[PDB]
mmCIF file of all heavy atoms in Angstrom:
data_model
loop_
_atom_site.group_PDB
_atom_site.id
_atom_site.type_symbol
_atom_site.label_atom_id
_atom_site.label_comp_id
_atom_site.label_asym_id
_atom_site.label_seq_id
_atom_site.Cartn_x
_atom_site.Cartn_y
_atom_site.Cartn_z
ATOM 1 N N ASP A 9 1.954 15.566 23.545
ATOM 2 C CA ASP A 9 3.260 15.006 23.880
ATOM 3 C C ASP A 9 4.268 15.420 22.831
ATOM 4 O O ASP A 9 3.998 15.451 21.637
ATOM 5 C CB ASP A 9 3.184 13.476 23.917
ATOM 6 C CG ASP A 9 2.403 12.954 25.120
ATOM 7 O OD1 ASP A 9 2.994 12.838 26.214
ATOM 8 O OD2 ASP A 9 1.199 12.611 24.967
ATOM 9 N N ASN A 10 5.470 15.754 23.310
ATOM 10 C CA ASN A 10 6.561 16.217 22.463
ATOM 11 C C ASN A 10 6.211 17.431 21.611
ATOM 12 O O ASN A 10 6.866 17.698 20.597
ATOM 13 C CB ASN A 10 7.062 15.070 21.602
ATOM 14 C CG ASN A 10 7.265 13.814 22.413
ATOM 15 O OD1 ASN A 10 8.223 13.688 23.186
ATOM 16 N ND2 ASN A 10 6.348 12.858 22.257
ATOM 17 N N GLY A 34 12.325 16.836 15.890
ATOM 18 C CA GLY A 34 12.248 15.386 15.723
ATOM 19 C C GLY A 34 10.841 14.822 15.670
ATOM 20 O O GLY A 34 10.646 13.592 15.670
ATOM 21 N N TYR A 35 9.839 15.708 15.677
ATOM 22 C CA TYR A 35 8.457 15.294 15.632
ATOM 23 C C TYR A 35 7.757 16.157 14.594
ATOM 24 O O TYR A 35 8.295 17.184 14.199
ATOM 25 C CB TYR A 35 7.814 15.465 16.998
ATOM 26 C CG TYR A 35 8.312 14.509 18.052
ATOM 27 C CD1 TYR A 35 9.608 14.652 18.598
ATOM 28 C CD2 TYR A 35 7.517 13.481 18.530
ATOM 29 C CE1 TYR A 35 10.092 13.766 19.537
ATOM 30 C CE2 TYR A 35 7.987 12.594 19.499
ATOM 31 C CZ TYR A 35 9.274 12.745 19.995
ATOM 32 O OH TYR A 35 9.737 11.867 20.959
ATOM 33 N N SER A 36 6.576 15.748 14.155
ATOM 34 C CA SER A 36 5.805 16.597 13.255
ATOM 35 C C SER A 36 4.313 16.462 13.491
ATOM 36 O O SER A 36 3.812 15.430 13.925
ATOM 37 C CB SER A 36 6.189 16.393 11.774
ATOM 38 O OG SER A 36 6.869 15.152 11.566
ATOM 39 N N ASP A 38 0.489 15.980 13.312
ATOM 40 C CA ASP A 38 -0.397 15.064 12.627
ATOM 41 C C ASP A 38 -1.820 15.473 12.951
ATOM 42 O O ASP A 38 -2.408 14.992 13.896
ATOM 43 C CB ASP A 38 -0.088 13.638 13.087
ATOM 44 C CG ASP A 38 -1.065 12.610 12.543
ATOM 45 O OD1 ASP A 38 -1.876 12.952 11.641
ATOM 46 O OD2 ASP A 38 -1.005 11.448 13.007
ATOM 47 N N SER A 56 -1.736 15.416 17.080
ATOM 48 C CA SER A 56 -0.642 14.917 17.922
ATOM 49 C C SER A 56 0.674 15.204 17.236
ATOM 50 O O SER A 56 0.712 15.741 16.112
ATOM 51 C CB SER A 56 -0.800 13.434 18.158
ATOM 52 O OG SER A 56 -0.877 12.764 16.925
ATOM 53 N N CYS A 57 1.758 14.881 17.925
ATOM 54 C CA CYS A 57 3.070 15.055 17.336
ATOM 55 C C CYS A 57 3.656 13.693 17.149
ATOM 56 O O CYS A 57 3.926 13.003 18.113
ATOM 57 C CB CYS A 57 3.942 15.901 18.244
ATOM 58 S SG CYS A 57 3.406 17.621 18.327
ATOM 59 N N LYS A 58 3.845 13.300 15.892
ATOM 60 C CA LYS A 58 4.413 11.981 15.587
ATOM 61 C C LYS A 58 5.910 12.068 15.332
ATOM 62 O O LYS A 58 6.371 12.947 14.602
ATOM 63 C CB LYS A 58 3.717 11.357 14.376
ATOM 64 C CG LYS A 58 2.210 11.298 14.504
ATOM 65 C CD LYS A 58 1.760 10.272 15.526
ATOM 66 C CE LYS A 58 0.252 10.078 15.457
ATOM 67 N NZ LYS A 58 -0.310 9.460 16.688
ATOM 68 N N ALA A 59 6.637 11.119 15.887
ATOM 69 C CA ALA A 59 8.095 11.066 15.834
ATOM 70 C C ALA A 59 8.660 10.744 14.461
ATOM 71 O O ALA A 59 8.058 9.962 13.707
ATOM 72 C CB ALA A 59 8.624 10.079 16.856
ATOM 73 N N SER A 60 9.812 11.333 14.181
ATOM 74 C CA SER A 60 10.648 10.990 13.032
ATOM 75 C C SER A 60 11.438 9.700 13.298
ATOM 76 O O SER A 60 11.460 9.230 14.419
ATOM 77 C CB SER A 60 11.611 12.138 12.769
ATOM 78 O OG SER A 60 10.911 13.284 12.353
ATOM 79 N N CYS A 61 12.064 9.175 12.245
ATOM 80 C CA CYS A 61 12.730 7.865 12.238
ATOM 81 C C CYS A 61 14.179 7.992 11.815
ATOM 82 O O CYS A 61 14.494 8.721 10.868
ATOM 83 C CB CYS A 61 12.064 6.952 11.216
ATOM 84 S SG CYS A 61 10.330 6.515 11.552
ATOM 85 N N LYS A 62 15.055 7.275 12.513
ATOM 86 C CA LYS A 62 16.424 7.000 12.038
ATOM 87 C C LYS A 62 16.340 6.170 10.785
ATOM 88 O O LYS A 62 15.585 5.209 10.702
ATOM 89 C CB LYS A 62 17.191 6.177 13.058
ATOM 90 C CG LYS A 62 18.079 6.960 14.004
ATOM 91 C CD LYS A 62 19.155 6.059 14.592
ATOM 92 C CE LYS A 62 19.907 6.734 15.752
ATOM 93 N NZ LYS A 62 19.043 6.861 16.961
ATOM 94 N N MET A 87 13.853 10.580 8.887
ATOM 95 C CA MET A 87 12.663 10.398 8.068
ATOM 96 C C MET A 87 11.467 10.976 8.799
ATOM 97 O O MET A 87 11.316 10.748 9.985
ATOM 98 C CB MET A 87 12.419 8.916 7.808
ATOM 99 C CG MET A 87 13.595 8.188 7.172
ATOM 100 S SD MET A 87 13.208 6.535 6.562
ATOM 101 C CE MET A 87 11.986 6.869 5.303
ATOM 102 N N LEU A 88 10.612 11.688 8.105
ATOM 103 C CA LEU A 88 9.428 12.201 8.763
ATOM 104 C C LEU A 88 8.389 11.126 8.853
ATOM 105 O O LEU A 88 8.246 10.329 7.943
ATOM 106 C CB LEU A 88 8.854 13.422 8.046
ATOM 107 C CG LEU A 88 9.786 14.648 8.100
ATOM 108 C CD1 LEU A 88 9.202 15.751 7.258
ATOM 109 C CD2 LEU A 88 10.014 15.083 9.538
ATOM 110 N N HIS A 89 7.644 11.106 9.943
ATOM 111 C CA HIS A 89 6.464 10.281 10.037
ATOM 112 C C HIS A 89 5.656 10.458 8.762
ATOM 113 O O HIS A 89 5.438 11.579 8.316
ATOM 114 C CB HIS A 89 5.640 10.704 11.231
ATOM 115 C CG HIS A 89 4.268 10.154 11.240
ATOM 116 N ND1 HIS A 89 3.928 9.013 11.961
ATOM 117 C CD2 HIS A 89 3.119 10.571 10.645
ATOM 118 C CE1 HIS A 89 2.643 8.763 11.805
ATOM 119 N NE2 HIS A 89 2.128 9.703 11.011
ATOM 120 N N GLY A 90 5.222 9.325 8.184
ATOM 121 C CA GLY A 90 4.498 9.319 6.924
ATOM 122 C C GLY A 90 5.372 9.099 5.698
ATOM 123 O O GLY A 90 4.868 8.685 4.643
ATOM 124 N N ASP A 91 6.684 9.395 5.798
ATOM 125 C CA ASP A 91 7.608 9.174 4.672
ATOM 126 C C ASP A 91 7.704 7.699 4.291
ATOM 127 O O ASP A 91 8.085 6.841 5.111
ATOM 128 C CB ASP A 91 9.028 9.653 5.013
ATOM 129 C CG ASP A 91 9.249 11.156 4.769
ATOM 130 O OD1 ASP A 91 8.495 11.782 3.968
ATOM 131 O OD2 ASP A 91 10.222 11.684 5.397
ATOM 132 N N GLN A 111 7.155 2.561 5.716
ATOM 133 C CA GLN A 111 6.770 3.907 6.129
ATOM 134 C C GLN A 111 7.276 4.260 7.528
ATOM 135 O O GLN A 111 7.173 3.457 8.445
ATOM 136 C CB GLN A 111 5.253 4.034 6.099
ATOM 137 C CG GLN A 111 4.778 5.397 5.688
ATOM 138 C CD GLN A 111 3.283 5.506 5.607
ATOM 139 O OE1 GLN A 111 2.560 4.635 6.071
ATOM 140 N NE2 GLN A 111 2.798 6.594 5.025
ATOM 141 N N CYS A 112 7.813 5.459 7.702
ATOM 142 C CA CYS A 112 8.067 5.949 9.041
ATOM 143 C C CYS A 112 6.721 6.147 9.717
ATOM 144 O O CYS A 112 5.858 6.860 9.203
ATOM 145 C CB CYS A 112 8.827 7.265 8.997
ATOM 146 S SG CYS A 112 9.202 7.949 10.628
ATOM 147 N N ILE A 113 6.519 5.449 10.840
ATOM 148 C CA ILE A 113 5.296 5.600 11.631
ATOM 149 C C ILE A 113 5.701 5.782 13.078
ATOM 150 O O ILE A 113 6.069 4.828 13.758
ATOM 151 C CB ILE A 113 4.362 4.400 11.507
ATOM 152 C CG1 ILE A 113 3.681 4.410 10.141
ATOM 153 C CG2 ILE A 113 3.302 4.433 12.599
ATOM 154 C CD1 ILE A 113 3.069 3.083 9.742
ATOM 155 N N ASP A 114 5.693 7.054 13.484
ATOM 156 C CA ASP A 114 5.874 7.473 14.864
ATOM 157 C C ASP A 114 7.182 6.940 15.425
ATOM 158 O O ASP A 114 7.257 6.453 16.546
ATOM 159 C CB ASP A 114 4.682 7.001 15.699
ATOM 160 C CG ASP A 114 4.573 7.685 17.064
ATOM 161 O OD1 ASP A 114 5.270 8.702 17.345
ATOM 162 O OD2 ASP A 114 3.767 7.192 17.865
ATOM 163 N N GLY A 115 8.233 7.007 14.622
ATOM 164 C CA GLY A 115 9.562 6.669 15.099
ATOM 165 C C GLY A 115 10.060 5.286 14.735
ATOM 166 O O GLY A 115 11.247 5.053 14.770
ATOM 167 N N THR A 116 9.147 4.369 14.379
ATOM 168 C CA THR A 116 9.533 3.061 13.835
ATOM 169 C C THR A 116 9.191 3.036 12.364
ATOM 170 O O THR A 116 8.119 3.474 11.971
ATOM 171 C CB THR A 116 8.830 1.890 14.536
ATOM 172 O OG1 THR A 116 7.618 2.364 15.134
ATOM 173 C CG2 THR A 116 9.710 1.265 15.624
ATOM 174 N N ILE A 117 10.142 2.570 11.554
ATOM 175 C CA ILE A 117 9.914 2.210 10.172
ATOM 176 C C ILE A 117 10.391 0.778 10.026
ATOM 177 O O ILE A 117 11.586 0.503 10.174
ATOM 178 C CB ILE A 117 10.703 3.095 9.165
ATOM 179 C CG1 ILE A 117 10.483 2.586 7.734
ATOM 180 C CG2 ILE A 117 12.208 3.137 9.446
ATOM 181 C CD1 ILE A 117 10.992 3.519 6.670
#
Side-chain angles (χ1 to χ4, degrees):
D9 289 277
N10 314 286
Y35 291 72
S36 18
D38 174 10
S56 56
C57 291
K58 307 290 189 198
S60 295
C61 295
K62 264 201 191 70
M87 304 192 63
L88 293 175
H89 167 97
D91 275 338
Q111 215 178 12
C112 180
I113 287 162
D114 195 12
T116 23
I117 176 169

